[PDB]
C-alpha cells in the first residue's frame, strides 16, 4: 500500500487495487483458522446446511432494513450470507427483495397485508426509489464535473483513471505528461495554505468558534440517548427467553478492529467488495 | 457350552428344571449383547478423554482458547 | 356468543402467486382443487 | 498429458497461477495412459512401482 | 438394540430434530426446538461456546500442519511490532461511531478549505 | 395390567379431552382483542407508509432536473446513492423529514379513530398495562357478528 | 504484513475514537466538544499531510522542505 | 407387490396350522423355514414402498411437491430403500433352504448344524430391517448415521459367514 | 425450515406462535367426530362380549 | 508419486488392511475345500453320523466376531478423520449441477471436443494445502459431485445443500464424473480441478 | 398432501367399514350371526383399530396445531424492530414505535 489512494472511489480503481492486493501469492493465509468460520461452521456442523444460508440472510435482511445497505455491519452480514449460501436461494432472495417484499413496513414478510395492497405500496415504493435514483445520477455527474475544477481535484481524477496501479502515481503521470508540474505545483500550494491555517491558533480557533454548536448538542443528545438505549435493550433482553422463538440481536456482527475475523481479512475492512446494489453500491 | 449361570448363583430356583434353563439362557443371552457395546463405548471415552488432553496440551497458552481448550472446561 | 379469535394462517406470498411457474392440471382437466 | 488452457478462447483464470505452459499445475494426473504415474490410487501396487513414493512431511 | 439406542439418542442429541410439534402441548412444554440458534447467546464468535454433537472427535485438532488461531497469530505480530496485543476483551463503539467522527472531520476540512 | 387399570387410563383420556377443549375455546376466544389491535396496528402503519411515501414523491417531482441547489441536494441528501440508504431512516434522522413523518402520524391517527372507533378502547389497554394486559380484555370484539371495519383484510395475506 | 500494518493503523484509531466516547460518555458535554474538536484538528492535519505525500516525487525538493 | 403380499401371508398361514401331527413347528425341513422368514420380510416392508410408489404417482398426476426442490427427495430414497434390501434378502434366502433340501437329497446325508442353519437364517432376516442405508452413504447422511449403518452392515454379515462354514 | 413469512419473537405480536400453530384444522368439530368414533368402539366391544357371554 | 491429499491416504490404508484380511481368510478356506475335495473325488472319508460338532460351532461363530470388531473400528475412524477438517477453511466455492454441465461460482463448464470426455472448457480451480468449502447443490435433478481419487463424492440433490471440505496438495488436474443418473447426457458431464 | 393423504387413508378404511357393518347388519338381522361369529370378530377388530388410528391422528394434530402459547397468550411487550430511540424537539430523549 504506497500508491493506494484511499480517498478515491473509482469502482475501476478499487478493482485494479483489487486485484494487486487480495493475489493469492501473498494475500493467502497459511495454516491459519479464523474463529468466525470455526463458529459458523460448529453450529452447523453436518452436511447439510439448508438452515444457515436463510438465518444469516435473515440477518442482514434486519441490518439492512434498519440501517441501510451502506451500513458497514450490514456489508458485513451480505458478505457472510453470500458466502454461506447457495446461489439458488440467493437468487429466489433477491429477485424476492428486488420486488420489496422483505421491507419492514409495507413487506408481506414482516406485515399481515393482503396481495393487492401490497402490489400498490410496491410499486409505489420503486418507483420512489427510480425518481431519486435519476435525481442522484444527475447530482453525481454534476458533482463529477465541478470536483475536477479544483487543483487537488484533478490530480485525483488523473490518478483514478490511469490504466494501471502504480507505485508512485503522480510521478507516472507526470513522466507520461498527462499532468502538469504547473497544475501539481498549484495543488500543493492551496494544500499548503490550509494546512498552515490549522497549525496557527488564529485560523483555528476561528474555525473551533464557528463549530461548537452542533458538537455541543450531538454530545448532549448522545449522553442523553444512551440510557435509554441500555433501558430498551434490558427491556428485549427480557424477551430473549420468553418463548421457543428467537429474538434477533441487530445487528448480528459488526465489523471489529480489535478482533478481525475472515471478513476484515478477505475484503480490507470492507475496501474490496463486489460492486452490486445488495452492497449498497450503484 | 454356555453352562447354567444360575445354578452357581442359587437364581429361580422355584421354577421347574425347563422353565430355569429358558431363565438362564436369557440371561446368557444378556451378557452376550452387552460386549461389544462396552468395547465401543471405552473406545469412545477414550477418545474423548484424549481429545480433551490434546486441547489442554496445545491451546495452553493460547490467548484465544486459553481458557476453554487449555482449562479443558468446554472441551 | 363470543367469536374465533385464531390468527389465520399465511399460505401463498404475492411474490409467489404464480408458485414458481409450474405445471398444475390436475387429472380432471383444469387447474383447480377437487374440493 | 497436460490440460490445453491456451487453446480455449476466453476462459477465466486465477490472478495468482502460473500460466507456463509447462508448468506442475497443468498436467493431468489421472484418466489418462502415462507410464509415468503422479498419482498414488486404490489400484497402484506400490510394489510394482518398488515404493519410490514420496516421504510423509512432504505431500 | 444398536438401532432402538441410535433413534433414543438421535431424538435427544440431534439440534435440528424436535419433538415439539410432533408430541400433545401437554408435553410440549419440556422441548427448546431453537436451542441450537440460542446457544453462546447466538453469537457465532467463538467455538466451544457452541455444541458439536458428534460421536467422536468432535474437536480433535486437525493432522497435516496443526493450526494456529488467526487472532494467535495477530497477537505475534502485533507484539513483534511493538503495538500493544490482541485485546480479545475489548467491545464496539457504539456511541460515536467512524461516520460521525469522520463527519466531524468533514465539516472542519470544508471550514478551513473555504477560509483558507 | 387388571380392568380397573384400563378404567384409570379412560378416566385420564377423558380428563385429557376435557382440558384440550376448554382449552381450545379459551384460546380462541382470548385471542379475538390481541388480533385486532395487530390489524389496526399494521393498517395505521400501512396508511402512514403511503403517506409518507406519497408526500416524498410529490416533493421530489418539485426538483427541476436541469438545476439541483443545495437545498435539494441536502433535502433529500443526493450524495449517498439510493441503494446505499434506507428510505425510511430519511423519516427518523434528517429535521424536515421527521417533522413530516410526525404530521403523519398524528393525521393518519386522527383519522383512523374515525374509521374504527373502538381503537381508542384498545389504546387504554395496552398504554396502561403492555400488550399482555390483553389475553381477555373484555369489550365491543366479544360478538360474532361485531363487524370491526376492516372488510376481512390486514388479518391475513388472503382476504378472511 | 501488509495488511497486519493497515490493521495496526485502523485499531489506533479506533482506540483513539473510543477513549473519545468514554469521554462524551462520563465528562461534561463541554469538555467533550472540545476533546473531539482537538482530536478532529490533529486528524485533519494528518489526512492533509496524506494528501501531500502523494504529491511528493513530483514536487520541487524547495517547497517540499517547506512542510516535511 | 400385491401379488407378494398375498402370497407371503398365504404361506405363513398354511405353514403355522395345517402341519401333520408330530411336526413342530421347529422341525418342519430347512426350506419351509426359510420360506416363512422371506414371507415376515415381504409383510413388513411392501406397505412402505406402496406408499413410495402412490407419493411418485401423486407428484406426476395432481402436481404435488413431495419430490421437488422443495421437497425431499431423499424421502423418497429412504422409503424405497426401506423397501430395497428386505427385497435383497427375500431374493437370497429361498435360494439357501433350496440348496439346503437338495444337498440333502443328494449328498446321502442330513444338514450339518440344521438348527444353526435355521437360526442363522432367521437372524439374517431380522437383521436386514436394520440396514437399509447403507445404499445412501452419498446422499449427505449424518456422521453418526453413516457410522451406524456401516456397524449395522458388518452385524449383518456375521451369520452369513456361519451359514457358509 | 425456511418460511416464507417471519417467526422471530418482538417484531410483531403474532409472529412467534406463527409457525408453531396450523390454525385451520377445524378442531372442536374434529374433537367431535372423535367422540362419535369412542362412542363406536366402546358401544362395540360392550356388545361383543355380551354376547360371548 | 505422491497422494493428492491426506484422506484418500487414509482411505487407501483401511482398504489395504481389509484386502489382507480377506485374502488371509479366502486362502484358509480355499485350503480347507482344497483338501475337502480331494477326499471327496476319491471316494474317501465318510462319514454319516458327522453332522455336529458343538466346539467348531461356537468356535467358528465367535472367531469372524473379533476379526470383525477391529474392521469396524478401523472404519468409524476413517470417516470422521475424512470430516475432521471441517472449520478450518479460508475459501468458499459453490457448486451447481445443471442439466449436463456444471456451475462454479456463476461460471460454465461443459465437454469439449479438444478431449474425448475427460476434459473441459472451464476446469475449477483451488490452492493447493489450503482448506476449501465446497458448497454443492443443483437445479433441475439428482446429479453426484465425484472426485474419488481426492476422496469427494457427494450427491448434488436439488432443494438439498451438502457441504463438504476440499484440500489438495498435489499440484494438477483431477478428472472425475457426474456419478448419478440425470438423464440422456450423463455419460457426458464431466468435473475437472485444477490444484495450483 | 401429507395432512390429506393420512385423511383420505382413514376415510378410505372408514368407508370399507362401514361397509362391513352394513353387511354384518344384514346377516344379524337374518340372525346367521351367532355369538361366535368371525364375521362378528373381524369386525369388532377392524372398528376398534380405525378408532385407534383416528385416535392417534387427533393426537397429532392437536400436537402439531396447539402450542403452550397459543394457550397461554405469550405475547411480548417491546416489539424491539420497530422502536427507535429519537431526541424530541424539547430536546429530552424519547420512545416511539415506528
Ligand atoms: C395402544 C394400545 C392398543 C392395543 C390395546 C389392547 C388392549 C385394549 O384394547 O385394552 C382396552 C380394552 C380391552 O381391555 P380389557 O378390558 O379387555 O382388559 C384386558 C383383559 N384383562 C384385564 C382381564 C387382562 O379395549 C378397548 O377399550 C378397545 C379399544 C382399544 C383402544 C383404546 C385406546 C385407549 C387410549
Ligand atoms: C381395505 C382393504 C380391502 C380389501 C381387503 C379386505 C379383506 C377382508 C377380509 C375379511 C375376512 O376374511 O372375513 C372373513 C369372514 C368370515 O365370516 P364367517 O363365515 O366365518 O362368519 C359366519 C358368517 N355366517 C354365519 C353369517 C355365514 O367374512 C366376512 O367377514 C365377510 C367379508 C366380506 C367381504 C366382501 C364384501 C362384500 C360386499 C362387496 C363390497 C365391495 C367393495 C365396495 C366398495 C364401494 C365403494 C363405493
Ligand atoms: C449411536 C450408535 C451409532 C454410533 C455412533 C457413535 C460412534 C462412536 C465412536 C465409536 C468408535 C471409536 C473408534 C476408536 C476411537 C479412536 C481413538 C483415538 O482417538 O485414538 C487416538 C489416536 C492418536 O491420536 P492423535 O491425535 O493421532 O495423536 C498423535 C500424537 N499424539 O488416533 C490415531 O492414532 C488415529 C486413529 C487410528 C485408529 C484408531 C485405533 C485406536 C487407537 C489406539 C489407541 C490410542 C493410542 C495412543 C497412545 C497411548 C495408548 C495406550
Ligand atoms: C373408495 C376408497 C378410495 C378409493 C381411491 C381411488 C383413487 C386412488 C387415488 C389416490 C389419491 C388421489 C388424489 C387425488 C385427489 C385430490 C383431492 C384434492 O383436490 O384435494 C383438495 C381438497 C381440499 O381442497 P381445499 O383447497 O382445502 O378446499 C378449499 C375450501 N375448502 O382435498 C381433498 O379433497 C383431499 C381428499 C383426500 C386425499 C386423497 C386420498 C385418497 C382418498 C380418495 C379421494 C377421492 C379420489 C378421487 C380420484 C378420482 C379417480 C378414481
Ligand atoms: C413415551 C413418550 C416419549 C416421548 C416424550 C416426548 C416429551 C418429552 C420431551 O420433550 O423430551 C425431551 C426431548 C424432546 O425435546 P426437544 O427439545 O424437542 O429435543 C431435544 C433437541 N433434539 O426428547 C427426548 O429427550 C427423548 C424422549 C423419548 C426417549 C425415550 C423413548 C422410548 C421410551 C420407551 C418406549
Ligand atoms: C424393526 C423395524 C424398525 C427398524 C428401525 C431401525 C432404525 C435405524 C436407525 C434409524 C435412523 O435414524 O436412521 C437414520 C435415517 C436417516 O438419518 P438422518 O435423517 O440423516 O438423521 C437425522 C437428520 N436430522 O433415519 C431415517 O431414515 C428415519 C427412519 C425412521 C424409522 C422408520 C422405521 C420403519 C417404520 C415402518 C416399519 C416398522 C415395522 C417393520
Ligand atoms: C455375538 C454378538 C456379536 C454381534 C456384534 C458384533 C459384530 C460386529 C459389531 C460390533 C459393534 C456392535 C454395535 C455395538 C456398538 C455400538 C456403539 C454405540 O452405540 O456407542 C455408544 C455411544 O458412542 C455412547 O453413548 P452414551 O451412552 O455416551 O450417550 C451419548 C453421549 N451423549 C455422547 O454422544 O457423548
Ligand atoms: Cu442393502
Ligand atoms: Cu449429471
Ligand atoms: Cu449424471
Ligand atoms: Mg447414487
Known amino acids: 500500500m504506497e500508491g493506494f489512494v484511499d480517498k478515491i472511489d473509482d469502482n475501476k480503481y478499487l478493482g485494479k487495487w483489487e486485484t494487486i492486493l487480495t493475489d493469492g501469492r501473498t494475500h493467502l493465509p497459511k495454516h491459519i483458522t479464523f474463529h468466525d468460520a470455526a463458529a459458523i461452521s460448529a453450529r452447523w456442523n453436518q452436511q447439510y446446511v439448508n438452515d444457515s444460508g436463510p438465518v444469516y440472510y435473515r440477518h442482514w435482511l434486519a441490518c439492512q432494513q434498519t440501517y441501510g445497505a451502506g451500513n458497514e455491519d450490514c456489508r458485513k452480514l451480505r458478505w457472510w450470507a453470500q458466502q454461506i449460501t447457495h446461489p439458488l436461494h440467493l437468487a429466489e432472495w433477491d429477485d424476492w427483495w428486488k420486488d420489496e417484499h422483505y421491507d419492514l413496513q409495507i413487506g408481506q414478510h414482516w406485515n399481515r397485508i393482503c396481495g393487492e395492497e401490497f402490489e400498490e405500496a410496491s410499486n409505489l415504493l420503486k418507483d420512489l426509489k427510480e425518481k431519486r435514483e435519476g435525481l442522484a445520477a444527475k447530482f453525481r455527474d454534476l458533482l463529477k464535473t465541478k470536483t475536477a475544477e479544483d487543483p487537488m481535484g484533478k490530480i485525483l481524477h488523473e490518478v483514478a483513471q490511469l490504466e494501471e496501479p502504480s507505485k508512485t502515481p503522480v510521478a507516472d503521470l507526470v513522466e507520461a505528461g498527462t499532468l502538469s508540474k504547473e497544475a501539481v505545483e498549484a495543488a500543493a500550494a492551496l494544500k499548503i495554505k490550509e494546512l498552515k491555517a490549522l497549525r496557527d491558533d488564529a485560523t483555528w480557533a476561528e474555525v473551533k468558534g464557528s463549530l461548537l454548536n452542533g458538537v455541543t448538542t450531538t454530545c448532549s443528545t448522545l449522553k442523553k440517548t444512551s440510557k435509554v438505549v441500555a433501558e430498551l435493550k434490558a427491556q428485549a433482553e427480557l424477551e430473549r427467553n420468553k418463548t421457543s422463538a428467537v429474538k434477533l440481536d441487530i445487528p448480528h456482527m459488526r465489523v471489529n478492529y480489535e478482533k478481525p475475523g475472515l471478513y476484515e481479512y478477505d475484503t480490507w475492512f470492507g475496501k474490496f467488495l463486489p460492486r452490486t446494489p445488495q452492497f449498497g453500491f450503484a | 457350552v454356555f453352562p447354567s449361570i444360575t445354578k452357581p448363583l442359587g437364581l429361580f430356583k422355584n421354577l421347574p428344571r425347563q422353565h430355569r434353563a429358558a431363565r438362564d439362557a436369557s440371561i446368557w443371552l444378556a451378557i452376550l449383547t452387552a460386549g461389544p457395546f462396552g468395547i465401543f463405548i471405552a473406545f469412545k471415552y477414550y477418545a474423548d478423554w484424549y481429545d480433551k488432553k490434546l486441547l489442554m496440551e496445545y491451546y495452553k497458552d493460547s490467548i484465544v482458547y486459553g481458557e476453554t481448550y487449555g482449562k479443558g472446561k468446554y472441551v | 356468543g363470543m367469536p374465533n379469535g385464531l390468527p389465520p394462517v399465511l399460505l401463498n406470498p404475492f411474490v409467489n402467486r404464480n408458485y414458481r411457474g409450474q405445471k398444475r392440471d390436475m387429472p380432471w382437466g383444469t387447474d383447480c382443487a377437487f374440493l | ?59 | 438394540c444398536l438401532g432402538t439406542f441410535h433413534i433414543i439418542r438421535c431424538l435427544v442429541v440431534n439440534p435440528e430434530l424436535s419433538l415439539a410439534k410432533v408430541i400433545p402441548e401437554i408435553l410440549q412444554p419440556f422441548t427448546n426446538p431453537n436451542a441450537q440458534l440460542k446457544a453462546a447467546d447466538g453469537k457465532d464468535d467463538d467455538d466451544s461456546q457452541v455444541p458439536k454433537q458428534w460421536g467422536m472427535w468432535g474437536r480433535h485438532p486437525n493432522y497435516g500442519v496443526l493450526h494456529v488461531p488467526f487472532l494467535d497469530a495477530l497477537n505475534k505480530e502485533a507484539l513483534a511490532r511493538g503495538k500493544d496485543g490482541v485485546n480479545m476483551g475489548a467491545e464496539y463503539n457504539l456511541v460515536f461511531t467512524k461516520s460521525m467522527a469522520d463527519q466531524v472531520v468533514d465539516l472542519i476540512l470544508d471550514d478551513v478549505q473555504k477560509r483558507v | 395390567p387388571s380392568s380397573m387399570a384400563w378404567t384409570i387410563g379412560w378416566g385420564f383420556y377423558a380428563a385429557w379431552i376435557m382440558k384440550e377443549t376448554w382449552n381450545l375455546r379459551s384460546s380462541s376466544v382470548g385471542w379475538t382483542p390481541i388480533t385486532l389491535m395487530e390489524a389496526y396496528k399494521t393498517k395505521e402503519r400501512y396508511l402512514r407508509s403511503k403517506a409518507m411515501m406519497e408526500r416524498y414523491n410529490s416533493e421530489l417531482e418539485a426538483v427541476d432536473d436541469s438545476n439541483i441547489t443545495e437545498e435539494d441536494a441536502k433535502k433529500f441528501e443526493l450524495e449517498k446513492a439510493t441503494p446505499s440508504i434506507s428510505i425510511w431512516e430519511q423519516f427518523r434522522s434528517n429535521p424536515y423529514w421527521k417533522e413530516v413523518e410526525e404530521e403523519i402520524s398524528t393525521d393518519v391517527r386522527k383519522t383512523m379513530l374515525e374509521k374504527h372507533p373502538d381503537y381508542a378502547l384498545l389504546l387504554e389497554a395496552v398504554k396502561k398495562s403492555g400488550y399482555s394486559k390483553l389475553w381477555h380484555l373484555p369489550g365491543p370484539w366479544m360478538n360474532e357478528h361485531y363487524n370491526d371495519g376492516l372488510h376481512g383484510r390486514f388479518l391475513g395475506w388472503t382476504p378472511k | 504484513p501488509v495488511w497486519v500494518d493497515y490493521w495496526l493503523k485502523l485499531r489506533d484509531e479506533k482506540r483513539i475514537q473510543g477513549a473519545l466516547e468514554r469521554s462524551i460518555l462520563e465528562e461534561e458535554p463541554e469538555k467533550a466538544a472540545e476533546k473531539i474538536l482537538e482530536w478532529a484538528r490533529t486528524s485533519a492535519q494528518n489526512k492533509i499531510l496524506e494528501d501531500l505525500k502523494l504529491l511528493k516525487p513530483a514536487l520541487s525538493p524547495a517547497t517540499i522542505a517547506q512542510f516535511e | 407387490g400385491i401379488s407378494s403380499t398375498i402370497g407371503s401371508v398365504n404361506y405363513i398361514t398354511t405353514n403355522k396350522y395345517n402341519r401333520h401331527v408330530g411336526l413342530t413347528f421347529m422341525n418342519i425341513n430347512i426350506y419351509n423355514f426359510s420360506i416363512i422368514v422371506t414371507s415376515i420380510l415381504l409383510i413388513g416392508s411392501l406397505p412402505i414402498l406402496g406408499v413410495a410408489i402412490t407419493g411418485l404417482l401423486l407428484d406426476r398426476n395432481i402436481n404435488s411437491t413431495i419430490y421437488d426442490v422443495i421437497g425431499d427427495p431423499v424421502l423418497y430414497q429412504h422409503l424405497f430403500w426401506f423397501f430395497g434390501h428386505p427385497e435383497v434378502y427375500v431374493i437370497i434366502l429361498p435360494v439357501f433352504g433350496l440348496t439346503s433340501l437338495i444337498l440333502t437329497s443328494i449328498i446321502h446325508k442330513d444338514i450339518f448344524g440344521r438348527e444353526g442353519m435355521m437360526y442363522c437364517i432367521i437372524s439374517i432376516g431380522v437383521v436386514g430391517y436394520f440396514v437399509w442405508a447403507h445404499h445412501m452413504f452419498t446422499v449427505g447422511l449424518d456422521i453418526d448415521s453413516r457410522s451406524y449403518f456401516s456397524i449395522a452392515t458388518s452385524i449383518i454379515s456375521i451369520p452369513t459367514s456361519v451359514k457358509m462354514f | 425450515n425456511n418460511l416464507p413469512y417471519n417467526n422471530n419473537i418482538a417484531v410483531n405480536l403474532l409472529d412467534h406462535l406463527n409457525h408453531n400453530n396450523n390454525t385451520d384444522i377445524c378442531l372442536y368439530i374434529i374433537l367431535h367426530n372423535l367422540l362419535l368414533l369412542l362412542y363406536v368402539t366402546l358401544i362395540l366391544q360392550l356388545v361383543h362380549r355380551y354376547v360371548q357371554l | 508419486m505422491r497422494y493428492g491429499n491426506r484422506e484418500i491416504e487414509s482411505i487407501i490404508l483401511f482398504f489395504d488392511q481389509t484386502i489382507i484380511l480377506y485374502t488371509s481368510i479366502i486362502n484358509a478356506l480355499i485350503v480347507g475345500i482344497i483338501i475337502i475335495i480331494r477326499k471327496w473325488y476319491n471316494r474317501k472319508g465318510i462319514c454319516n453320523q458327522y453332522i455336529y460338532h458343538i466346539k467348531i460351532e461356537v468356535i467358528w461363530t465367535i472367531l469372524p466376531i473379533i476379526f470383525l470388531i477391529v474392521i469396524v473400528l478401523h472404519s468409524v475412524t476413517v470417516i470422521y478423520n475424512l470430516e475432521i477438517n471441517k472449520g478450518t477453511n479460508n475459501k468458499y466455492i459453490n457448486v451447481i449441477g445443471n442439466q449436463w454441465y456444471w456451475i462454479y461460482n456463476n461460471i460454465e463448464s461443459r465437454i469439449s471436443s479438444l478431449g474425448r470426455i475427460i476434459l473441459v472448457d472451464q476446469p475449477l480451480f483451488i490452492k493447493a494445502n489450503n482448506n476449501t468449502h465446497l458448497i454443492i447443490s443443483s437445479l433441475d435433478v439428482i446429479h453426484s459431485f465425484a472426485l474419488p481419487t481426492l476422496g469427494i463424492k457427494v450427491d448434488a440433490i436439488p432443494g438439498r445443500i451438502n457441504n463438504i471440505s476440499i484440500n489438495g496438495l498435489t499440484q494438477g488436474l483431477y478428472v472425475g464424473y457426474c456419478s448419478e443418473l440425470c438423464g440422456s447426457g450423463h455419460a457426458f458431464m464431466p468435473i475437472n480441478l485444477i490444484v495450483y | 398432501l401429507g395432512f390429506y393423504m393420512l385423511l383420505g387413508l382413514h376415510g378410505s378404511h372408514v368407508i370399507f367399514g362401514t361397509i362391513m357393518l352394513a353387511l354384518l347388519t344384514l346377516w344379524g338381522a337374518q340372525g346367521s350371526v351367532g355369538p361366535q361369529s368371525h364375521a362378528l370378530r373381524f369386525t369388532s377388530l377392524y372398528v376398534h383399530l380405525v378408532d385407534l388410528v383416528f385416535i392417534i391422528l387427533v393426537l397429532a394434530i392437536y400436537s402439531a396445531n396447539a402450542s403452550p402459547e397459543l394457550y397461554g397468550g405469550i405475547v411480548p411487550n417491546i416489539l424491539e424492530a420497530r422502536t427507535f430511540v429519537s431526541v424530541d424537539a424539547a430536546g429530552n430523549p424519547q420512545i416511539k414505535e415506528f
Do not use: G, H, M
Open chain 4, 1 to 59: 498429458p497436460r490440460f490445453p488452457f491456451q487453446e480455449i478462447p476466453e476462459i477465466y483464470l486465477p490472478s495468482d497461477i502460473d500460466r507456463d505452459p509447462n508448468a506442475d499445475c497443468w498436467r493431468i494426473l489421472n484418466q489418462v495412459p502415462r507410464k509415468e504415474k503422479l498419482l498414488v490410487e486404490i489400484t497402484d501396487p506400490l510394489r510394482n512401482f518398488d515404493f519410490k513414493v514420496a516421504k510423509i512431511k512432504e505431500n
